[PDB]
């Protein structure tokens, strides 16, 4: 068994990928699994230990690149949209990706915002009129 | 001046009660929310 890791399972023909976190919803003795609106599998009872495990989708989202231009500088920053990226680079297999992407895909400067996470840009304590709108009240600039 | 001030204060006071006691006063925005939710729900339902 694996917890807090993205994995595709098979429970008596119930196929799907997700995270098998602990849950608290109470089932009924005759009920096998659970569903929510739009008919998507939500919770599945453990066949052996008789425990209910919630199922959540594996992480996914878009990628955006913040650049001040080409004539100004070649420095860019990467924003991963609506994903908690404080954990992505270690658990996943990044062997296929070249180290050229790895250098700019990690570092000591990782900023977690409400629109996702920002890699390659430092957080300052001074507020100015903003140039590039990131989202949720956060902007970026070349300083 | 005093009469006008009192009338304005009374109207401002009654505005809150008028807004809170009517269940359909703010229906111009819930309509938008419900329409967007219904559209998104219909799109996903087509996957089956």
């Amino acid at each position: 068994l694996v917890k807090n890791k993205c994995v595709n399972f098979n429970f008596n023909g119930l196929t799907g990928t997700g995270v098998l976190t602990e849950s608290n919803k109470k089932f009924l003795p005759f009920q096998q699994f659970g569903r929510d609106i739009a008919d998507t599998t939500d919770a599945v009872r453990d066949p052996q230990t008789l425990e209910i495990l919630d199922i959540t989708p594996c992480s996914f989202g878009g990628v955006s690149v913040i650049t001040p231009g080409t004539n100004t500088s070649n420095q860019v920053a990467v924003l991963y949209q609506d994903v908690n990226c404080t954990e992505v680079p270690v658990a996943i297999h990044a062997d296929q990706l070249t180290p050229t992407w790895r250098v700019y895909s990690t570092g000591s400067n990782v900023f977690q915002t409400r629109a996702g996470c920002l890699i390659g840009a430092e957080h300052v304590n001074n507020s100015y009129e903003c140039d590039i709108p990131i989202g949720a009240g956060i902007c970026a600039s070349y300083q | 001046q005093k009469l006008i001030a009192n009338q304005f204060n009374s109207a401002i006071g009654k505005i809150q009660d008028s807004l809170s006691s009517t269940p359909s006063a703010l229906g111009k925005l819930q309509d938008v929310v419900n329409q967007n939710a219904q559209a998104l729900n219909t799109l996903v339902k087509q996957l089956s």
Binding site: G135, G137 | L26
Partner: peptide
Amino acid sequence: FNKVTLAQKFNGLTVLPPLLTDEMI
């Protein structure tokens, strides 16, 4: 704000947060 009240994310459908948070408005 109390009178009007409003989630899921599946099948490659995402919702982007607004630029102006409600505090700014």
